[PDB]
């Protein structure tokens, strides 16, 4: 009910990062940076506010992500001078996936390693439901160039995180919104049928079945690819002794 | 000091007291009671289900809104109570599903009502990309494990069709993954130092690890040029059939 700013932070969490930046769209036309701060003025001070008055949307950075998530629920679809403000988390411009993490790698060892290409805001080695590592990681930098450095250096180079000499793999993080998704308000031939199970003997069944048989050979063939890739890697694992 | 003040503002339509506002609460003092647990989270409104494991030590508590359980998470995690230091996290989801091969013109509400034929859906979502286009994937979250197993089972046996186009959806079990909390330093023996005595660095060419790392690299090079043949080979058959 009543939050103490100046005491509202997850441990280690950094302030005014790209993760606590908001996209505020479907804006009124007379909107200014001054009025932007006014809407979010209860969430404490805000960092940068960039407002594309031509496109009718803008950005504002808050202190912590939870502050922004609070804001996002209090101000989404909020009516402002005729239009309904849409409020979402902004895309991360320097987010990176890391595969082939070793063990005894930790959120901190990652932030330490990747810090060599620029300022890291966050780095987390993703853990399964049993608390163990998956081999995947997240590394979010302060700005684009540090991620283009990290991306490029780790593709041409061989970046080893531990004594074990299998280098890590580094790809850009796909910026997908899996909270709001696609509502009906957005978006007739394709709807004129309901969700149903394709019934045997029908035309739609036969096509469904033609598709599922094509996924089969696609899986069978992929399976032979990652089968001998697996055992080649596996051979390699042996010779290290 | 400066503050924020809220009240009772939840979106309409959004379901409440789902698995997604359930907090795991660990490191409990052994004399913890339910009555005392609710008083603890009473800042954040009346709470739904409260569980306390038999040997005390940990429990769970449904809050109303995911965003409400966020606020309680950061204000109460690491909080001392009777000397112990509470670990607050979100509990896992026991009834979560990813769906692939979605047809176009599917929405959160359609997906939701589609999969209700198997049980109580609490959330559906059509994952979109950076330009707000559907991604072809989606999440379906049920309230109970039996519903999500039913939706799994009936969707590998049959061809579930969400629109008129006869391309059946693919329905897999949501891999439970923590990209929020990860594996901190404090949560990690002897091979530990075997492994951690080389700092992060690049392989220096002409070294017993550069030659090895190159091998690991050449296998990635193969793996990719081989999957492309398959991509090639399948995309040809895919078009034919269509
Ligand atoms: C996903 C996850 O973190 N799990 C799976 C089961 N639970 S839970 O926290 O998801 C959960 C279970 C029941 C419930 O309400 C009745 C709410 C939440 C987990 C957990 O915390 N248990 C610890 C555990 C048990 C067993 C194993 O391996 C055999 C590992 C961890 C963990
Ligand atoms: C990249 C970015 O800042 N966004 C966030 C706001 N929206 S979104 O609501 O579609 C969204 C997509 C992905 C996501 O990942 C976390 C979060 C939100 C975006 C958006 O609509 N950008 C404007 C735009 C400009 C041009 C075009 O051309 C098709 C489309 C959209 C993306």
From Swiss-Prot, chain A:
There is a cross-link at residues 6, 42, 45, 72, 136, 144, 189 (Glycyl lysine isopeptide (Lys-Gly) (interchain with G-Cter in SUMO2)). Keywords: Acetylation, Activator, Biological rhythms, Chromosomal rearrangement, Chromosome, Coiled coil, DNA damage, DNA recombination, DNA repair, DNA-binding, Immunity, Innate immunity, Intellectual disability, Isopeptide bond, Methylation, mRNA processing, mRNA splicing, Nucleus, Phosphoprotein, Repeat, Repressor, RNA-binding, Transcription, Transcription regulation, Ubl conjugation. DNA- and RNA binding protein, involved in several nuclear processes. Binds the conventional octamer sequence in double-stranded DNA. Also binds single-stranded DNA and RNA at a site independent of the duplex site. Involved in pre-mRNA splicing, probably as a heterodimer with SFPQ. Interacts with U5 snRNA, probably by binding to a purine-rich sequence located on the 3' side of U5 snRNA stem 1b. Together with PSPC1, required for the formation of nuclear paraspeckles. The SFPQ-NONO heteromer associated with MATR3 may play a role in nuclear retention of defective RNAs. Residues 1-241 are annotated as: DBHS. It is linked to A chromosomal aberration involving NONO may be a cause of papillary renal cell carcinoma (PRCC). Translocation t(X;X)(p11.2;q13.1) with TFE3. Intellectual developmental disorder, X-linked, syndromic 34: A syndrome characterized by intellectual deficit, delayed psychomotor development, poor speech, and dysmorphic features. Residues 20-87, 94-175 form the RRM domain. The modification Phosphoserine is found at residues 93, 202. The N-terminus is blocked. It is found in: Nucleus; Nucleus, Nucleolus; Nucleus speckle; Chromosome. This is Non-POU domain-containing octamer-binding protein. The gene is NONO. Changing residue 211 to A: Abolishes interaction with PSPC1 and localization in nuclear paraspeckles. The modification N6-acetyllysine is found at residues 144, 235. Changing residue 207 to A: Abolishes interaction with PSPC1 and localization in nuclear paraspeckles. Monomer and component of the SFPQ-NONO complex, which is probably a heterotetramer of two 52 kDa (NONO) and two 100 kDa (SFPQ) subunits. NONO is a component of spliceosome and U5.4/6 snRNP complexes. Interacts with CPNE4 (via VWFA domain). Forms heterodimers with PSPC1; this involves formation of a coiled coil domain by helices from both proteins. Part of complex consisting of SFPQ, NONO and MATR3. Part of a complex consisting of SFPQ, NONO and NR5A1. Part of a complex consisting of SFPQ, NONO and TOP1. Interacts with SPI1 and SPIB. Interacts with RNF43. Interacts with PER1 and PER2. Heart, brain, placenta, lung, liver, skeletal muscle, kidney and pancreas. Also found in a number of breast tumor cell lines. It comes from Homo sapiens. GO terms for cellular component: chromosome; fibrillar center; membrane; nuclear matrix; nuclear speck; nucleoplasm; nucleus; paraspeckles. One of its GO terms (molecular function) is DNA binding. One of its GO terms (biological process) is cellular response to hypoxia. The keyword Secreted does not apply.
Curated annotation (Swiss-Prot), chain B:
Heart, brain, placenta, lung, liver, skeletal muscle, kidney and pancreas. Also found in a number of breast tumor cell lines. Disulfide bonds: none annotated. One of its GO terms (cellular component) is nuclear speck. GO terms for molecular function: chromatin binding; DNA binding; identical protein binding; lncRNA binding; RNA binding. There is a cross-link at residues 7, 43, 46, 73, 137, 145, 194 (Glycyl lysine isopeptide (Lys-Gly) (interchain with G-Cter in SUMO2)). The keyword Transferase does not apply. Residues 1-242 are annotated as: DBHS. The N-terminus is blocked. Keywords: Acetylation, Activator, Biological rhythms, Chromosomal rearrangement, Chromosome, Coiled coil, DNA damage, DNA recombination, DNA repair, DNA-binding, Immunity, Innate immunity, Intellectual disability, Isopeptide bond, Methylation, mRNA processing, mRNA splicing, Nucleus, Phosphoprotein, Repeat, Repressor, RNA-binding, Transcription, Transcription regulation, Ubl conjugation. The keyword Ubl conjugation applies. The modification N6-acetyllysine is found at residues 145, 240. The modification Phosphoserine is found at residues 94, 207. One of its GO terms (biological process) is negative regulation of DNA-templated transcription. It is found in: Nucleus; Nucleus, Nucleolus; Nucleus speckle; Chromosome. Residues 21-88, 95-176 form the RRM domain. It is linked to A chromosomal aberration involving NONO may be a cause of papillary renal cell carcinoma (PRCC). Translocation t(X;X)(p11.2;q13.1) with TFE3. Intellectual developmental disorder, X-linked, syndromic 34: A syndrome characterized by intellectual deficit, delayed psychomotor development, poor speech, and dysmorphic features. DNA- and RNA binding protein, involved in several nuclear processes. Binds the conventional octamer sequence in double-stranded DNA. Also binds single-stranded DNA and RNA at a site independent of the duplex site. Involved in pre-mRNA splicing, probably as a heterodimer with SFPQ. Interacts with U5 snRNA, probably by binding to a purine-rich sequence located on the 3' side of U5 snRNA stem 1b. Together with PSPC1, required for the formation of nuclear paraspeckles. The SFPQ-NONO heteromer associated with MATR3 may play a role in nuclear retention of defective RNAs. Monomer and component of the SFPQ-NONO complex, which is probably a heterotetramer of two 52 kDa (NONO) and two 100 kDa (SFPQ) subunits. NONO is a component of spliceosome and U5.4/6 snRNP complexes. Interacts with CPNE4 (via VWFA domain). Forms heterodimers with PSPC1; this involves formation of a coiled coil domain by helices from both proteins. Part of complex consisting of SFPQ, NONO and MATR3. Part of a complex consisting of SFPQ, NONO and NR5A1. Part of a complex consisting of SFPQ, NONO and TOP1. Interacts with SPI1 and SPIB. Interacts with RNF43. Interacts with PER1 and PER2. (Microbial infection) Interacts with HIV-2 Capsid protein p24; interacts with high affinity. Interacts with HIV-1 Capsid protein p24; interacts with low affinity. It comes from Homo sapiens. The chain holds residues 54 to 297 of 471 of the full protein.
């Amino acid at each position: 009910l009543t939050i103490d700013l100046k005491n509202f932070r997850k441990p280690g969490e950094k302030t005014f990062t790209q993760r606590s930046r908001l996209f505020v769209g479907n804006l009124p036309p007379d909107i200014t940076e001054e009025e932007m701060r006014k809407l979010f003025e209860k969430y404490g001070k805000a960092g940068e506010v960039f407002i594309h008055k031509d496109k009718g949307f803008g950005f504002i950075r808050l202190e912590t992500r939870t502050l922004a998530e609070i804001a996002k629920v209090e101000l989404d679809n909020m009516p402002l001078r005729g239009k309904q403000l849409r409020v979402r988390f902004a895309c991360h411009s320097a987010s990176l996936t890391v595969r082939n993490l070793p063990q005894y790698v930790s959120n901190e060892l990652l932030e330490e390693a990747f810090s060599v290409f620029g300022q890291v805001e966050r780095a987390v080695v993703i853990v399964d439901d049993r608390g163990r590592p998956s081999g995947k990681g997240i590394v979010e930098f302060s700005g684009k160039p540090a991620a283009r450095k990290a991306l490029d250096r780790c593709s041409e180079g061989s970046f080893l995180l531990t004594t074990f000499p299998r280098p890590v793999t580094v790809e850009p993080m796909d910026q997908l919104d899996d909270e709001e998704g696609l509502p009906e308000k957005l978006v007739h031939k394709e709807r004129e049928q309901p969700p149903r199970f394709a019934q045997p003997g029908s035309f739609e069944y036969e096509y469904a079945m033609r598709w599922k048989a094509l996924i089969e050979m696609e899986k069978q063939q992929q399976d032979q690819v990652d089968r001998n890739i697996k055992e080649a890697r596996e051979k390699l694992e042996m010779e290290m002794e």
